[PDB]
Amino acid sequence: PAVNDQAAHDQYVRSHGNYEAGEQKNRNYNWKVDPQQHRFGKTDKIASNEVV
């Protein structure tokens, strides 16, 4: 096969942006929160029925 390997798969990512079908641009930031959880959004303050 003489196939490329994940050890070389990432390198090709950095060189010419050559990927495999259906995979995403990984920038490897520093997530203080877990990407899978946490709804990645902003919440505007909303209390109970204030007219009470």
């Binding site: 505007d44 303050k45 909303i46 204030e50 007219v51």
Partner: protein
């Protein structure tokens, strides 16, 4: 004596009820499970105004929940105080209205009325003496304006000597909630005007206008707008249940509000209203209530009152207060705006006093008045309707259930006639 029943149709009518009954319930201190827990004997004196009795000592509200779809009905039950309703009186359909007015008045709704017309009959005769009917429904929805209006028309023929009230939330022009808003509203008034003893317009647009400029809140919810109305609805019927200087039943409000046979539409405004942080700085004096209660921004309708003249004015002062101060404030305001009050009806303000104030405050006022300002709300609806009909847009659904083009034309004729006649007296002089 002089008791009333409660009937609601469509989710707009039903949703409103969820607050009124919870709004009204607190006043007498009835706990959710029907066990009395109030302080004063006055709290129990007129439990006959809206309630009844049953074995076991637990009370129950007399309501009629009528609609064609299960989404709205299955929800209100689970809410707080939702266990008070008798499951026997529940009635519901299985198909759904789909917002087609013709669908909810002749094709589907007409079939299910017999069951609903049955429930209404027992309560009316089952009481000591029936005073009238109060109903909450939406003029902007297919199931409401179609099936809702059917209930009133049949009822009126049966009980010629009773009065009725309808608190309809007419759809404002800027924000529309149903692409069929024009048709289902224009047709609705046709039947309503003939037999509806009374009808007062409340604008959802006003609901949003009042909150963001007076209460000083950040994000209202559907309950927020709902809460006020349920408090408001008690205002007209507040003085029928508690002792006071000048008691005034629902009819008495009728006598001094409708000068002529057809002009029978009203608008309301609630005060006082102070914000969370502004709840203490404002000083409470009887003159304080008057300014806002006639204040333009306090009117609960989109129509601007300053663009017309008041045919008649009514006011229900709430709580204990010096009798004269109630009047002296009223007359002065009557002269200080002599131009805005039509000149051919002297002494065009009524007053009332109820000694038991709503819990949480010390003095409050509910505004009701028939004014030439309500002219605009029809014209805005009139302009929209004429646009669509010329191109027969959105018409196939309505005509496919037996309706014929002429009936639509006839409804408009009455609609415009009411608007034209209303401005007839605006320029009238003595």
């Amino acid at each position: 004596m002089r008791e009333i029943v409660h009937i609601q149709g469509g989710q707009c009518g039903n949703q409103i009820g969820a607050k009124f009954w919870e709004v009204i319930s607190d006043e007498h201190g009835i706990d959710p499970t029907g066990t009395y827990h109030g302080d004063s004997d006055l709290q129990l004196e007129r439990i006959n105004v809206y309630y009844n009795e049953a074995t076991g000592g637990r009370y129950v509200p007399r309501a009629i929940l009528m609609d064609l779809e299960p989404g709205t009905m299955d929800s209100v039950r689970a809410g707080p105080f939702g266990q008070l309703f008798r499951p026997d009186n529940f009635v519901f359909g299985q198909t759904g209205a789909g917002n087609n007015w013709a669908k909810g008045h002749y094709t589907e709704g007409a079939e299910l009325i017999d069951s609903v017309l049955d429930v209404v009959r027992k309560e009316a005769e089952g009481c000591d003496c029936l005073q009238g009917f109060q109903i909450t429904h939406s003029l902007g929805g297919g199931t409401g304006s179609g099936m809702g209006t059917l209930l009133i028309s049949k009822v009126r023929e049966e009980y010629p000597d009773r009065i009725m009230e309808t608190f309809s939330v007419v759809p404002s022009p800027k924000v529309s909630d149903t692409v069929v808003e024009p048709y289902n509203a224009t047709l609705s008034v046709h039947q309503l005007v003939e037999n509806a003893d009374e009808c007062m317009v409340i604008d959802n647009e006003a609901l949003y206008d009042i909150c963001f400029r007076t209460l000083k809140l950040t994000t209202p919810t559907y309950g927020d707008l709902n809460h006020l109305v349920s408090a408001a609805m008690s205002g007209v019927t507040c003085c029928l249940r508690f002792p006071g200087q000048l008691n005034s039943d629902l009819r008495k409000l009728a006598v001094n509000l409708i000068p002529f046979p057809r002009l029978h539409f009203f608008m309301i405004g609630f005060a006082p209203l102070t914000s969370r942080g502004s709840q203490q700085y404002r000083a409470l004096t009887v003159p304080e209530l008057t300014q806002q209660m006639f204040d333009a921004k306090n009117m609960m309708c989109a129509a601007d009152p300053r663009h017309g003249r008041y045919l008649t004015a009514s006011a229900l002062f709430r709580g204990r207060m010096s009798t004269k101060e109630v009047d002296e404030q009223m007359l002065n305001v009557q002269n200080k705006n002599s131009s805005y009050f039509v000149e051919w009806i002297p002494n065009n303000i009524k007053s009332s006093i109820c000694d038991i104030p709503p819990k949480g405050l010390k003095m409050a006022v509910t505004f009701v008045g028939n004014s030439t300002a309500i002219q605009e709300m029809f014209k805005r609806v009139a302009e929209q309707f004429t646009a669509m009909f010329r191109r027969k847009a959105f018409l196939h659904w309505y005509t496919g259930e037996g309706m014929d083009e002429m009936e639509f034309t006839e409804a408009e004729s009455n609609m415009n006639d009411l608007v034209s006649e209303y401005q007839q007296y605006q320029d009238a002089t003595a």
